[PDB]
Design a protein around this ligand. Structure first.
Ligand code: BEF
Ligand SMILES: [Mg+2]
Length: 1003
């Protein structure tokens, strides 16, 4: 059935061959079940571990590490011996690191997926269908419903499938469509057909879409769509069809990996070129194509040694710690790199109903008659706190808490509110929240009566389930509730007959429609003749409440003291209801709205400080949307919103330049379709802006998946939590701001341990290449370089992730999405450091061979030509040949490298802040990890079996002083670089602590 809302009830009944009185037969049931199938959405679940690891290995850095591992493995295989375990130890540990990284990623993904399934009420879905089996209604599962079934639905049940309304058993039918359309107020439904074929879901007032629940009434209709043919099913298909890009952090890491691969391949071909033509010698060869094999084998090994190994491990550790700190704030993050996304977010789009506001109408204002002076009056006004259905808030007259017992008008108002409504407020122990039973605009009055204790009952001893309806129960016990005159659209009010345990008729309705019938005023306990001045004053106050800064749904409450008895009452016709209440006594009025969350007003301001633009994209009308915008702080109370607030059509009828100016300056989009939100998010991203979308409904699912990060509310639909990358399990909007902080800190710290590692490694390159150029004996060998790069470069690089965040971190605009991790300057700035690690280490070794007392004081010629020392005495008159394999210079080089790395982790605490102004004890984890790395290095020296694995031997005090002399100037070098970076001794205890070391070392 196509466009069932455009066709009358008779023809849509005949198209399916179903009679509204009888229903469907089991034959037709099976005939439709075999075609359409089950009425449920296809479940998409997390993939197996293998397909998760496949995407864990999608990072370019992990691919580079795996390529380097395979290369070093096929290079270690050139040796005929298969038992060379010292050569295969490097690819094995690289593979272990990569496998651990992938396992941690998969574990985080699975833990996040499991934490979101707990935010799902395990409720069975049922429906009431009229089939030809039995005459009475049949309660069956909604999965078995097929297009054509007659479905009967009453107040308080979810709509099982798309239903074309055939008959309304009650006078009116009110449905809550906040899930699909985002409307805060319930919609009145009618069986009349809608002429527009391409009408939006809000214009379809004869259809009941799936997932929505009935607020009030009872009706019967015909199913027209099931499964994926429903509206929510179409929205889920549109969500699944949307594309999913890579997070900004993943893009930055891919760019850095491309730069790294360009660097690694550069030094390889450079060494190959500078060493080509150097194998024309006959030694171990004799050809040119054969000469490019040994030099290639050494150059590729050098280039692989240039690559950092613990970088993805420390990145994953930092991201996982960030995810843990966010989950401690009730925020479920699916992916690791999504923790940084809110740090670089420029625009935060947000749904209104349920996301920015609660979905729980609450009375926030009220007023009664305090005094009367003649042709005028005085209005006693109160404001009530509380933005949910929980009866916890308080009432304040002007600014101070007051008791409503002294006021008789407030007692009458509470009586009217508790007796005129037919809704209720229950408590769900499973979710621990209070919920409504009927319409929201009557649960508001129920919670109001529960808030203002007019009888001063004691609710402290009562439990939560009894505290939900205690005061209403007391008021109902005091006055018995007789028949209720049904609400009529012409009279625009509803009344209730009441006889105490004389007769009073309590009327509740629209302000003007009710006040046009009130002829007297209740002031305290006194009846007073009504005049035009009182009327115009009350009407002006209502118009002030009904619009302006506070757009409130207003409700007038009156009483009838002398009504005619039920004997003279005639309830056959609806038109007698208004004439039965021609004379009324105005008691007061109340004003309720869909209140924003209590954490949104400060959150929009904090996001404004951090440079984030908040946009509201909602399906509700522009009135309520702009009201909530002015309330939370997006707009001002008097700010013109002519070119800052749009609708769906008002945005569609704009030219591309107009749409550009809108997306660049608008802040409120109202009455938008689920595809309109995706269009807005796509435009905001087309303007090169990392976009964040927050939502709780199905209509947000196509948008939450389009944004770089999509945040869903913990109470929202399952589709929204499916399309989202973050989930606020506690419906706390302020948490988002907190998240924006972490993604700002983490990334900063990230850059730190991306430099401190990278620079370190290039040092171990300049140490080797120079040793190949000068011809000196090998100072640093890969077996100890692996231990360095892992242990003494992962503990400081991990502790550098705990750096204290900046003081103005949340006071600056988001970072430019175009700038890379390693800039030009920060490139040079590390090259220098790398060079210093190349010149020092080698030098240290040479020192032990030239100037050390214990070492053989050979000449530079004898040092560079140690290959000729194998001969007895060509030029080496007394020096030993075995001494060129001594472990003392190798230990000197290793200790110098480790000490330079410790000092470089020391002065890597901040990018530009000097070590004097920011002492190292600011990050106690950094100094702790430095102590641990030095302790593990000394462990390598003085334990029994490990000094045999690494060709190193312990030192003495003089050689350690020399190591310090060689290594410490790296701090001066980095301080000079930081000074140059800033321009183009605040901590005096640190200075007086380091002066002994400097004077003792350079004594
Ligand atoms: F829930 Be939103 F206002 F579409
Ligand atoms: Mg919503």
């Amino acid at each position: 059935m196509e466009n069932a809302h455009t066709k009358t009830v008779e023809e849509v009944l005949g198209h399916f061959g179903v009679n509204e009185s009888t229903g469907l037969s089991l034959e037709q049931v099976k005939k439709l079940k075999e075609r359409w199938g089950s009425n449920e959405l296809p479940a998409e679940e997390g993939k197996t571990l293998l397909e998760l690891v496949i995407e864990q290995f999608e990072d370019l850095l992990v691919r580079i590490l795996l390529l380097a591992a395979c290369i070093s493995f096929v290079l270690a295989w050139f040796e005929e011996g298969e038992e060379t375990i010292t050569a295969f130890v490097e690819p094995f540990v690289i593979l272990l690191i990569l496998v651990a990284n992938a396992i941690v990623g998969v574990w985080q993904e699975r833990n996040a997926e499991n934490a979101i399934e707990a935010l799902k009420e395990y409720e069975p879905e049922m429906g009431k269908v009229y089939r030809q089996d039995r005459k009475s209604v049949q309660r069956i599962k909604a999965k078995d419903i097929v297009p054509g079934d007659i479905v009967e639905i009453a107040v308080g049940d979810k709509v099982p499938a798309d239903i074309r309304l055939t008959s309304i058993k009650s006078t009116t039918l009110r449905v809550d469509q906040s899930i699909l359309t985002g409307e805060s107020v319930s919609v009145i439904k009618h069986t009349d057909p809608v002429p527009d074929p391409r009408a939006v879901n809000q214009d379809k007032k004869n259809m009941l879409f799936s997932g929505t629940n009935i607020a009030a009434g009872k009706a019967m209709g015909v199913v027209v769509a099931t499964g994926v043919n429903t509206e929510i099913g179409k929205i889920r298909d549109e969500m699944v069809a949307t594309e999913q890009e890579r997070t900004p952090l993943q893009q930055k890491l891919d760019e850095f990996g491309e730069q790294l691969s360009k660097v690694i391949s550069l030094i390889c071909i450079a060494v190959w070129i500078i060493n080509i033509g150097h194998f024309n010698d006959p030694v171990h060869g004799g050809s040119w194509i054969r000469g490019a094999i040994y030099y290639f084998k050494i150059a590729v090994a050098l280039a692989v040694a240039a690559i950092p190994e613990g970088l993805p491990a420390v990145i994953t550790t930092c991201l996982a710690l960030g995810t843990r700190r966010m989950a401690k704030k009730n925020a479920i993050v699916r992916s690791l790199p999504s923790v940084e996304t809110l740090g670089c977010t420029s625009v935060i789009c947000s749904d209104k109903t349920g996301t920015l506001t609660t979905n729980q109408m609450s009375v926030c204002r009220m007023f009664i008659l305090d005094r009367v002076e003649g042709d005028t009056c005085s209005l006693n006004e109160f404001t009530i706190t509380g933005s949910t259905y929980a009866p916890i808030g308080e009432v304040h007259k002007d600014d101070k808490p007051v008791n409503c017992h002294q006021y008789d008008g407030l007692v009458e108002l509470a009586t009217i509110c508790a007796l005129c409504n037919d809704s209720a407020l229950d408590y769900n122990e499973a979710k621990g929240v209070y919920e409504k039973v009927g319409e929201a605009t009557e649960t508001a009055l129920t919670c109001l009566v529960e808030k203002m204790n007019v009888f001063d009952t004691e609710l402290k001893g009562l439990s939560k389930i009894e505290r939900a309806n205690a005061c209403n129960s007391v008021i109902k016990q005091l006055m018995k509730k007789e028949f209720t005159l049904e609400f009529s659209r012409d009279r625009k009010s509803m009344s209730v007959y009441c006889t105490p345990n004389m007769s009073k008729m309590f009327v509740k309705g629209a302000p003007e429609g009710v006040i046009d019938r009130c002829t007297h005023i209740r002031v305290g306990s006194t009846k007073v003749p009504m005049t035009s001045g009182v009327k115009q004053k009350i009407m002006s106050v209502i118009r002030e409440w009904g619009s302006g800064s506070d757009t409130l749904r207003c409700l007038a409450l009156a009483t009838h003291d002398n009504p005619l008895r039920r004997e003279e009452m005639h309830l056959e016709d609806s038109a007698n209801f208004i004439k039965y209440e021609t004379n009324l006594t105005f008691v007061g009025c109340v004003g309720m709205l869909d209140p924003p969350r209590i954490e949104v007003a400060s959150s929009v301001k904090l996001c404004r400080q951090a440079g984030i633009r908040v946009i509201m994209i909602t399906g509700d009308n522009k009135g309520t949307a702009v009201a909530i915008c002015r309330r939370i702080g997006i707009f001002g109370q008097d700010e013109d919103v002519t070119s800052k607030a749009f609708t769906g059509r008002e945005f569609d009828e704009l030219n591309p330049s107009a749409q550009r100016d809108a997306c660049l300056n608008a802040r409120c989009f109202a009455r938008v379709e689920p595809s309109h939100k995706s269009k807005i998010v796509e435009f905001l991203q087309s303007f090169d802006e990392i976009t964040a979308m927050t939502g709780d409904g199905v209509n947000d699912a196509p948008a939450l998946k389009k944004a770089e990060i999509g945040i869903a509310m913990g109470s929202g639909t399952a589709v929204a939590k499916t399309a989202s990358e973050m989930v606020l399990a506690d419906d706390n909007f302020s948490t988002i701001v907190a998240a924006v902080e972490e993604g700002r800190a983490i990334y900063n710290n990230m850059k730190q341990f991306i430099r401190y590692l990278i620079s370190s490694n290039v040092g171990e390159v300049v140490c080797i290449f120079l040793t190949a150029a000068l011809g000196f004996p090998e100072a640093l060998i890969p077996v100890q370089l692996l231990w360095v790069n892992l242990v003494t470069d992962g503990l400081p690089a991990t502790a550098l992730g705990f750096n204290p965040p900046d003081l103005d971190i949340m006071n600056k605009p988001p970072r430019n999405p175009k700038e890379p991790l390693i800039s030009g300057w920060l490139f040079f700035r590390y090259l220098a450091i790398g060079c210093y690690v190349g010149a020092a280490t080698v030098g240290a070794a040479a020192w032990w061979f030239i100037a050390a007392d214990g070492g053989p004081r050979v000449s530079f010629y004898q040092l560079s030509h140690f290959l000729q020392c194998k001969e007895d005495n060509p030029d080496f008159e007394g020096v030993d040949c075995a001494i060129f394999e001594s472990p003392y210079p190798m230990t000197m080089a290793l200790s110098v490298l480790v000490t330079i790395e410790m000092c470089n982790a020391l002065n890597s605490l901040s990018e530009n802040q000097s070590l004097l102004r920011m002492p190292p004890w600011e990050n106690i984890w950094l100094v702790g990890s430095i102590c641990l790395s030095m302790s593990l290095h000394f462990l390598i020296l003085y334990v029994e079996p490990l000094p045999l694995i690494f060709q190193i031997t312990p030192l003495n005090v003089t050689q350690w002083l020399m190591v310090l002399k060689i290594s410490l100037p790296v701090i001066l070098m980095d301080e000079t670089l930081k000074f140059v970076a800033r321009n183009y001794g605040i901590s005096w205890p640190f200075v007086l602590l380091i002066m002994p070391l400097v004077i003792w070392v350079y004594s």
